[PDB]
RNA sequence: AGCCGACUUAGAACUGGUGCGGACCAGGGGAAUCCGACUGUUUAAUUAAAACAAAGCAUCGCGAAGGCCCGCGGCGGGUGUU
RNA sequence: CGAUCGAAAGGGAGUCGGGUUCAGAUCCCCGAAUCCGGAGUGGCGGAGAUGGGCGCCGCGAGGCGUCCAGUGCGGUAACGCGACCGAUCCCGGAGAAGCCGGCGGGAGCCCCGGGGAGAGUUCUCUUUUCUUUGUGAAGGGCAGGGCGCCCUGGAAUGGGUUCGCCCCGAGAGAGGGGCCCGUGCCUUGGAAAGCGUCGCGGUUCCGGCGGCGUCCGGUGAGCUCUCGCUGGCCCUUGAAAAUCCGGGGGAGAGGGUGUAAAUCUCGCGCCGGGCCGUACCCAUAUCCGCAGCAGGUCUCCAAGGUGAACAGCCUCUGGCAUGUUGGAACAAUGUAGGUAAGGGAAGUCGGCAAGCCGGAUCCGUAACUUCGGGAUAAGGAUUGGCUCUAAGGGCUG
């Protein structure tokens, strides 16, 4: 809703910031196993709880 | 907004300390004198083209005049 | 209170695509007064024709846009509807200009 | 003209609830909605407001009365008995 | 006497290849039997009923340290602001 | 009278107009306001309040000195005027009230007759058809609406009066006033802005500059909203508190006749208003049903015609692309629609399904009954178009 509270909006802010892909330079590292971001979330598919 | 019926009270409202500006609107069958004070925009309505011109010289010199168009 | 209106079609006359005379006899046969079109409704509507300027006067209530309607009827009669355009420069007057493409 | 022959107030109930029940409730529904005379101002503007409450339109006087009538015969006799006992006690 | 305006109702004449609530909108009816008075409600996803409820009628308990009931327990609680 | 919590639909002071973005606006910009809180010196003005007597003087106009008064004033009244001291205490009001019916007023929308401006048709006709044609909050004035407000006067041959009601010697009619709401009109705002139309600029990056116009009327059992009056219903009587105000009391305070005092809900002047939410969807694709699922999910606005109608059908503003695809064929059997000679339920467990009837006007209407009904009982007749006639009203003298 548009009638958010501060803690809910801050939680949504963090979950917005975690929803970006991995930077390109991390898999040029030596001890690297990550191919992509597997913890990604789409707004239509996964409904974040709440 | 406030309307001043007489000419004599208009001079006191223009000579107030809080009079920011005075502006003259020249339309048909009417001359309008508007003093922007702190709270109200005081308007003097003159339907005499001779008295409008003499009052225009009779404004106080410390007040800022903006002849509108 | 006399009502006087002017219709100045200077531009189509100087271009030669239309002549003001054939417009003026079309007016003098085609203005209706009190439901009667022929014979000018008596001597109440007078029409003078200057050089590409037709002046009309009337002491009965005469609508100005009736002249616009009759002029657009004349342009449709002589296929000038897609070329000329009847506008009002000042009031009690009408102008024949062109469409402003290119 | 005369609209109904034997039903009065209870003609609003139509063809329901039983003839004897309608005949019972007819007396209550007449006396409940009738306007009584006022004992204080004399005007006939003593109208029921709720059960036990009768309000006068002119005098603005409201009286605790009966449920369907302004006065009950079970209380008029009590009023008489209390005034005779009041005279008896003081002699 | 003059000047103004709003929708209706009734009647008459004429008229169409008897068609005219021209589309749309829009009750089939009657004589009876059984049950439930009726209005209402009900098995969400097989049963809407004659089942339930209902007003009316009739019994039963109780005058408050009481009747009925709740609660592991309290000078506990509901009916009871009775 | 119980800490405290408990409503983004209850209560709850106070913001509106124009413009602006690729995406935000009662929040940004401009212009107009407004509410609350604050103040020693209280910033100013006004009110409190500057009056009378005596004795002199001055011709008088008036001037000094004493003795006092002065916490305002007007109206018969309803009450009014810009203020107009007062505490602990007490009383009262507002917040603060259901559902339904009828009527009246005011807006908005629709409707009709004209003037403009711009468009559409013009094969023939059409002074024709379409679009548009205005003013915020706050203040002041005036209409209009309401009054269970006041004064005179005393009424039956009873009157006044509504749609209905209802009112009156506890004072009707008839005259004269008073109050409340005034969302309507005018004015300040405010034409400077907005809109329509025409034309010039900036070669453009422009709240660019100009010329005109934004007008006059009439109507309505119209629809919606709102205000008000009156009535009906209840064995149903339809919230509380925060907060605010008025009154009754008169403990007190202030000054001795003035650079008057205490005090002020009057007019201005000064400062401030912190924290959180604000984008978008809101539903045959942004929510819940495993999904862009024919399901479900609370509200506001509500044009023209036909018509009783927020019914159905067509259209305007606005919107969309036929609902997770297209092309070509037109076989059966399907699904969804129809139509059928003659017969008319012979079909079937069973008139299942389908069909008949249907609106309105005119008559007409049984058995039975709890007298209310049954009842649109049943039964028939009429219905188009066009041209007329008659009847049903206000305004002015
Ligand atoms: Mg979902
Ligand atoms: Mg039998
Ligand atoms: Mg039943
Ligand atoms: Mg079931
Ligand atoms: Mg079923
Ligand atoms: Mg709270
Ligand atoms: Mg709230
Ligand atoms: Mg009277
Ligand atoms: Mg302008
Ligand atoms: Mg007092
Ligand atoms: Mg928004
Ligand atoms: Mg879809
Ligand atoms: Mg399709
Ligand atoms: Mg398609
Ligand atoms: Mg057949
Ligand atoms: Mg047949
Ligand atoms: Mg058979
Ligand atoms: Mg058989
Ligand atoms: Mg059937
Ligand atoms: Mg029957
Ligand atoms: Zn009384």
Are the C-beta atoms of D24 and D17 separated by less than 8 Å? no
Strand F-contacting residues in D 44-83, CB cut-off 7 angstroms: 45, 49-51, 57-60, 67
| Residues, Cβ < 5 Å to ion ligand 21 | D 38, 40-41, 56, 59, 61
Which one, of B24, B20, B63, B61, lies nearest residue B40 by Cα? B20
Annotate A1-50 with three-state secondary structure. CCCCCHHHHHHHHHHHHCCCCCCHHHHHCCCCCCCCCCCCCCCCCCCCCC
- Lookup result for tokens 């339907």: B47
Q: Which two tokens stand for residue B23?
A: 């502006």
Confirm whether residue D44 is marked as ligand binding.
no
Experimental method: cryo-EM
Phi, psi of B9 (to 5 degrees): -75, -25
Distance CA B64, CA D36 (A): 79
Distance CA A15, CA A27 (A): 24
Q: Is the C-beta of residue D16 closer than 7 Å to nucleic acid chain E?
A: yes
Residue C40's Cβ-count burial label (10 Å; 0-12, 13-18, 19+) is middle
Strand segments (E) across B1-69: 2-4, 21-27, 30-36, 41-46, 65-67
The angle subtended at Cα B48 by Cα B44 and Cα B49, nearest 5°, is 105
Distance CA B68, CA A23 (A): 61
Q: Which residues contact D75 (CB under 8 A, 6 or more apart)?
A: D66
Q: CA Rg, chain A, in Å?
A: 15
Which one, of A27, A49, A47, lies nearest residue A37 by Cα? A27
Please, which residues bridge with residue A47 across strands?
none
Which one, of B39, B34, B43, B26, lies nearest residue B64 by Cα? B34
Subunits with at least 3 CB pairs below 8 A relative to chain D? none
Ligand nearest, relative to CA of residue A46? 1
Within chain B, how many helices (H) and strands (E) appear?
Answer: 2, 5
- Residue B11: CB atoms within 10 Å: 16
- Residue D59: CB atoms within 10 Å: 15
Q: Edge-to-edge, what's the strand order for the sheet holding B2-4?
A: B2-4, B41-46, B30-36, B21-27, B65-67
Distance CA C95, CA C89 (A): 7
Give distance CA C47 / C1' F111 (Å).
38
What is the greatest pairwise CA distance in chain C?
46
Q: Which two tokens stand for residue C102?
A: 């290119």
DSSP, collapsed to helix, strand or coil, labels residue C62 as coil
Which one, of D48, D88, D42, lies nearest residue D65 by Cα? D48
Are the C-beta atoms of B44 and B10 separated by less than 8 Å? yes
Distance CA D66, CA D34 (A): 13
Q: Which helix (H) or strand (E) holds C96?
A: strand C93-98
DSSP, collapsed to helix, strand or coil, labels residue B2 as strand
Distance CA A33, CA A23 (A): 14
Give distance CA D15 / C1' F345 (Å).
39
**DSSP code for D37:** P
Please, which residues bridge with residue B4 across strands?
B44
Which one, of C78, C82, C83, lies nearest residue C98 by Cα? C83
**DSSP code for D12:** G
Distance CA C72, CA C75 (A): 5
Q: What is the DSSP string of C16-46?
A: TS--HHHHHHHHHHH--BTTB-GGGGSTTEE
Distance CA C28, CA C45 (A): 9
Give distance CA D1 / C1' F360 (Å).
29
Residue D41's Cβ-count burial label (10 Å; 0-12, 13-18, 19+) is middle
């Amino acid at each position: 809703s548009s009638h958010k509270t501060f803690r809910i909006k801050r939680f949504l802010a963090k979950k917005q910031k975690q929803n970006r892909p991995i930077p390109q330079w991390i898999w040029m590292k030596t001890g690297n196993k990550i191919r992509y971001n597997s913890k990604r979330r789409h707004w239509r598919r996964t409904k974040l709880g709440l | 907004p406030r309307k001043i019926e007489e000419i004599k009270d208009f001079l006191l409202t223009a000579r107030r300390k809080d009079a920011k500006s005075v502006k003259i609107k020249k339309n048909k069958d009417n001359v309008k004198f508007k003093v922007r004070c702190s709270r109200y925009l005081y308007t003097l309505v003159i339907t005499d083209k001779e008295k409008a011109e003499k009052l225009k010289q009779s404004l106080p010199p410390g007040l800022a005049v903006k002849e509108l168009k | 209170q006399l009502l006087k209106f002017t219709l100045d079609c200077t531009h189509p006359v100087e271009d030669g695509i239309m002549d003001a005379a054939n417009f003026e006899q079309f007016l003098q046969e085609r203005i209706k007064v009190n439901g009667k079109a022929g014979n000018l409704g008596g001597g109440v509507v007078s029409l003078e024709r200057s050089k590409s300027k037709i002046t009309v006067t009337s002491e009965v209530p005469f609508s100005k846009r009736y002249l616009k309607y009759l002029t657009k009827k004349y342009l449709k009669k002589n296929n000038l509807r897609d070329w000329l355009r009847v506008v009002a420069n000042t009031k009690e007057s009408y102008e024949l200009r062109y469409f402003q493409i290119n | 003209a005369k609209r109904t022959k034997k039903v009065g107030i209870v003609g609003k109930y139509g063809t329901r609830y039983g003839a004897s029940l309608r005949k019972m409730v007819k007396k209550i529904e007449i006396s409940q909605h009738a306007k009584y005379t006022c004992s204080f101002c004399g005007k006939t503007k003593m109208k029921r407001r709720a059960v036990g409450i009768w309000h006068c339109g002119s005098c603005m006087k409201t009286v605790a009365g009966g449920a369907w009538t302004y006065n009950t015969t079970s209380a008029v006799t009590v009023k008489s008995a209390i005034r005779r006992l009041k005279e008896l006690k003081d002699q």
